[PDB]
């Protein structure tokens, strides 16, 4: 939670309230990127491709 | 032909992807001194 | 930010989910820049998405409550967040992958809030200029503050909506940043009591927005706070008339709470939209560009309540007029004029003295920069606008022109029609004419770019004759051997024997000594990142003194505000094509030299002529080679690439596009010089190298028949010659076979011709074949 | 899309995603850059106020191509539904939104039109295709079919023939004995391999089949010249 | 394709070659400090 800013805690608590389990850092990275004006649908693309190698 | 230049490109793309994360690594470290 | 931040978040992010290889991480980067816009316009329907993520959330209610409250604080990235969340809970899948891999893996605060905002204006104001604060009594007097004090329910409702606490509806003590509660008298009518109910919203709304009134009004919330306090003042005293006059109604016997509902109906609505947006402001802490942005965005919110809207575009035009006064001031005058740090251009004080000994642009790019959180949602699309006419006029101003724009104009806030952008525009392209103009005829860059030609790039051959005649003795010795008054006093002999003294910039030309031989570096630079890095590491540096002829380049000084567009990086590269052109000449000398010397030899010796045929096939085969290099090199690249040069920079909009050009020459003269390919440069230095050698044992050779076993001597003088040719065909038909795999393979069209160059007559063609 | 925009709801998507594109690929085109206003799309129920909505309709878009180049609203007032009675509520909301409407996407189109000519010179495109794709520098085609046949006769495989080395000389040599091919149109043709055949098939009539012309299209004639439209020229 | 494969190539390459020279100057740098 030190990771993630005040602003960055508090989207996290609401992914949360969604149900979204994420790591502080990793929420924390996507934030910055949010903050780059990358789209996110770019952005879900590209979680998209990074998780689907990563069989369970 | 086609697939020759795109794997020269691929191979640049990648020494290029490498040398901008040294180089953001050597900023943030001249930044830390 | 760091211009690779993105691959440090990208790199980070492999590592967290644990992707196997960064092979790939170039492929994510590419897809998140190329669909990454520098502004939000993916206007994303928040309310469909929240709706998907309550219908996907487990806590769907909590969803929804923090979704408003975000909103209400103008919370960043809270729609885009609630996006990403509906497509992570889209895919099913990839939020599995996540979780598993996560697993595995008031009046104190207010007080507080304005000592904080003064210290970092202070921080902020080196120059020591306190900002304003409002006398203590100002705040601790609560008669001034205009909060409720901690036939009759009509009587005390029009107190009520006084803030004044009536007989029979009294306000309750704010509790927090709370809206004021009422207490009505139990003893009352029900209907009565919930019509006093129903109205008293209007005095809780009228508290609410005196509180925030009177909490905004402190310098320390800014200027565009001031004047959104002082515009919501004025709809709270005209409201207060309203009151007065539902009193005087009410004197008269006129007023009925049912007349009264009525009547206040338009003066609820108003009070709550105020309210709102008191509160709205409060929560967000927003200020400058961020409270802009947040009226913008209530504006459009309002686009179905015609008198909210109203309401909203008046507050917003009052609260952008400062910010708009700073961003005027900035793109007429490159002045930032922002006493809180409210506008979206922060200057840093960065010294330009720095720009020619810094390889980056730092005075250039860190003297201003746009602070992301105080650009104005309506001037997001101009700030980068803002910040270059900034930078054109404060540049132009420190080179001492004064830049007013002739099109200055005060800019206010508008909706629909976005005047202020085209204004910015129009702003940033006459500073970016001034400051492009300055660069040209007071920096005069044409003419410096001309001297640079003429020095680095080894225009003025006279000049490079001269300079070499007068130098050679000195440049042979070794570096630590030589002496540096004798290069500068050859240096001024070239420039004063040759047609450059004619050139006022003439004594911009230096001479520099590298400490690295052109070869070794070049090869160091393009092994990093690759292969080679570790192997140029430990190749231990050999320890051959450096010779004045490896390490000589020249530098050119360039004077701000000029020492912009003529840098370090710049002045290197003009170095690395003068040291090139050097380097060809020495060789090419040397092979005249030896020509010479075997034509001396050819005169003293009859019977010797025959033995001398070899040296002078393998001397010739190395002059025409390296006379053919130097061709390529001075009329393919660096002639066409300045001619280049010279028109793009007769193209030039602003100075940066002349500092594109001028990077952009200077990128394909080393491009076209066959500079960037590590292999062939390496063959280019073995064959240079050889036919150094070679000339140095062919001086030796004639020098020593001159000054005169014999028959063992010539033997091996042709054993040796032998062998150097052996070597330097070697080493050109790895050259042109490098050539021709680079122009089949990677299209370099360009190699073709440096092939048909090196064998336009087919010696090695049949070699190359072989 | 609204039942009552049914009938012009694909013209008015068609016409968001077109200025859409226009923005994101050439935003400072003429017609993409004009801050010429666009026509106000509203509701009207009264058939004063429609002719007068219309009215402002035509006068905006005229003065816009010149750049380039009450319902219930009130009481007492009883035309505002005269249209309402007049007409039948989904007729008079399709008159009374579609005019405007149909303004407006007739200036889009007209100012796409115009913008797809002169700036993105789709005309300049086809005439490239023709005097590179369509082989219309006679003197190339026929070196090149010379060329072509010398060495699928002599059976050379496309390692051979096919090598860049080899196709950039034959290119070379086509563009240098054909009058139009110096021409920057031709300069937009590249000579492509599909596949790399072991052996030139004696007599094959397809043998050359691997070889393809492909024709760049940038934003935003990409989306209208699509890959597709280019594998179908190659 | 062709033209526009052999753009990308030179192009990547002239980026690679200009990180290279950057991290070089910046390992210089660093060396020196």
């Given amino acids: 939670k030190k990771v993630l800013s005040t602003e960055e805690m508090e989207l996290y608590e609401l992914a949360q309230a969604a149900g979204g389990a994420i790591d502080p850092d990793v929420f924390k990275i996507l934030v910055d990127l949010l903050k780059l004006n990358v789209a996110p649908l770019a952005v879900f693309q590209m979680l998209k491709s990074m998780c689907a190698g990563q069989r369970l | 032909n086609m697939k020759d230049f795109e794997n020269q490109i691929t191979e640049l793309k990648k020494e290029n992807f490498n040398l901008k994360l040294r180089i953001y690594f050597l900023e943030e470290r001249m930044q830390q001194e | ?115 904080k905002m003064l210290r970092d204006k202070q921080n902020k104001k080196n120059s020591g200029q306190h900002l304003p604060i409002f006398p203590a009594w100002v705040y601790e007097r609560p008669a001034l503050i205009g909060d409720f004090l901690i036939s009759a329910v009509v009587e005390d409702l029009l107190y009520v909506l006084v803030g004044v606490d009536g007989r029979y509806v009294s306000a309750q003590p704010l509790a927090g940043r709370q809206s004021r509660t009422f207490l009505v008298d139990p003893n009352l009518d029900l209907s009565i009591r919930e019509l006093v109910h129903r109205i008293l919203p209007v005095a809780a709304s009228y508290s609410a927005v005196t509180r925030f009134i009177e909490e905004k009004s402190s310098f320390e919330y800014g200027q565009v706070n001031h004047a959104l306090a002082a515009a919501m003042r004025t709809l709270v005293k005209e409201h207060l008339i309203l009151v007065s006059q539902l009193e005087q109604l009410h004197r008269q016997g006129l007023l009925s709470l049912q007349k009264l509902w009525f009547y206040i109906q338009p003066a609820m609505r108003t009070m709550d939209i105020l309210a709102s947006l008191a509160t709205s402001v409060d929560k967000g802490e927003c200020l400058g560009g961020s409270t802009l942005s947040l009226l913008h965005d209530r504006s459009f919110s309002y686009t179905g309540d015609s008198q909210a809207q109203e309401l909203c575009l ?140 003429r020095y680095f790039l080894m225009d003025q051959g006279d000049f490079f004759v001269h300079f070499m005649d007068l130098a050679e003795e000195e440049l042979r010795k070794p570096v630590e051997d030589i002496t540096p008054p004798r290069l500068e006093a050859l240096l001024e002999l070239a420039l004063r024997m040759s047609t450059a003294n004619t050139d006022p910039f003439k004594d911009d030309l230096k001479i520099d000594l590298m400490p690295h031989d052109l070869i070794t570096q070049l090869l160091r630079v393009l092994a990093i990142e690759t292969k080679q890095e570790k192997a140029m590491a430990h190749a231990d540096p050999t320890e051959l003194a450096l010779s004045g002829l490896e390490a000589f380049s020249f530098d050119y000084i360039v004077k701000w505000p000029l020492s912009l567009i003529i840098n370090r990086k710049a002045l290197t590269r003009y170095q690395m094509l003068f040291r090139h052109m050097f380097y060809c000449k020495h060789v090419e000398r040397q092979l005249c030299s030896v020509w010479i010397s075997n034509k001396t030899a050819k005169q003293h010796s009859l019977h010797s002529a025959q033995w001398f045929a070899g040296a002078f096939t393998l001397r010739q085969r190395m002059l025409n080679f390296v006379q053919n290099i130097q061709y390529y090199m001075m009329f393919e690249v660096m002639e066409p690439t300045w001619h280049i040069l010279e028109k793009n920079l007769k193209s030039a909009s602003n100075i940066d596009d002349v500092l594109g050009h001028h990077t952009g020459f200077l990128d394909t003269c080393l491009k076209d010089c066959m500079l960037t390919n590590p292999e062939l440069l390496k063959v280019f230095s073995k064959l240079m190298s050889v036919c150094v050698m070679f000339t140095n044992c062919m001086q030796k050779f004639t020098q020593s028949m001159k000054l005169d076993d014999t028959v063992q001597l010539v033997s091996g003088f042709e054993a040796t010659i032998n062998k150097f040719d052996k070597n330097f065909s070697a080493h050109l038909l790895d050259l042109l076979a490098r050539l021709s795999i680079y122009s089949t393979s990677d299209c370099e069209h360009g190699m073709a011709s440096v092939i048909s160059r090196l064998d336009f007559n087919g010696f090695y063609t049949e070699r190359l074949e072989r | 899309v609204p039942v009552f925009l049914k009938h012009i709801a694909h013209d008015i998507y068609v016409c968001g995603k077109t200025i859409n594109l226009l923005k994101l690929c050439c935003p400072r085109h003429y017609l993409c850059w004009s801050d010429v206003p666009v026509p106000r799309i509203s509701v009207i129920f009264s058939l004063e106020e429609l002719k007068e909505i219309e009215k402002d309709c035509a006068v905006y878009v005229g003065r816009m191509e010149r750049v380039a180049r009450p319902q219930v609203q009130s009481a007492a007032d009883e035309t505002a539904v005269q249209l309402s009675e007049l007409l039948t509520l989904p007729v008079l909301m399709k008159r009374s939104i579609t005019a405007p409407l149909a303004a407006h996407i007739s200036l889009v189109n007209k100012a796409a039109v115009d913008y797809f000519f002169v700036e993105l010179h789709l005309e300049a495109h086809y005439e490239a295709l023709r005097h590179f794709l369509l082989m219309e520098d006679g003197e190339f085609a026929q070196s090149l079919s010379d060329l072509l046949f010398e060495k699928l006769g002599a059976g050379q495989t496309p390692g051979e023939l096919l090598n860049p080395l080899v196709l950039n000389s034959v290119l070379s040599k086509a563009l240098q004995c054909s009058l139009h091919g110096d021409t920057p149109h031709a300069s937009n043709l590249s000579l492509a391999l599909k596949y790399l055949p072991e052996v030139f098939a004696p007599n094959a009539p397809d043998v050359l089949s691997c070889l393809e012309l492909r024709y760049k299209v940038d934003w935003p004639l990409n989306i209208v010249i699509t890959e597709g439209c280019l594998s179908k020229y190659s």
């Fill in chain 3, 1 to 115: 930010m760091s211009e690779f931040r993105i691959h440090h978040d990208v790199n980070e992010l492999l590592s967290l989910l644990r992707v196997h290889g960064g092979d790939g991480a170039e492929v994510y980067i590419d897809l998140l820049q190329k669909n990454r816009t520098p502004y939000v316009t993916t206007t994303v329907s928040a309310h469909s998405a929240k709706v998907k993520i309550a219908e996907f959330s487990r806590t769907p209610e909590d969803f929804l409550k923090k979704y408003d409250e975000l909103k209400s604080k103008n919370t960043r990235n809270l729609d885009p967040l609630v996006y990403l969340l509906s497509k992570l809970t889209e895919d099913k899948e990839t939020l599995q992958y996540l979780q598993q891999n996560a697993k595995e893996r008031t009046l104190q605060q207010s007080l507080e809030l304005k000592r």
């Fill in chain 3, 314 to 453: 008046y507050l917003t035009k009052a609260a952008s007029a400062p910010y708009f006064e700073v961003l005027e001031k900035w793109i007429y005058r490159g002045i930032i004029h922002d006493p809180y740090s409210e506008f979206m251009v922060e200057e840093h004080e960065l010294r330009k003295e720095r720009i020619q000994e810094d390889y980056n642009d730092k005075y250039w790019d860190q003297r201003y920069t746009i602070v992301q959180q105080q650009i104005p949602s309506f001037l997001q699309k101009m700030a980068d606008k803002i910040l270059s006419t900034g930078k054109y006029l404060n540049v132009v101003r420190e080179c001492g022109h004064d830049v007013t724009c002739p099109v200055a104009k005060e800019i206010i806030y508008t909706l629909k029609e976005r005047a202020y952008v085209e204004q910015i525009e129009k702003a940033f392209n006459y500073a970016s004419k001034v400051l492009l103009d300055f660069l040209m005829e007071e920096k005069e860059l044409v003419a410096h770019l001309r001297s640079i030609k």
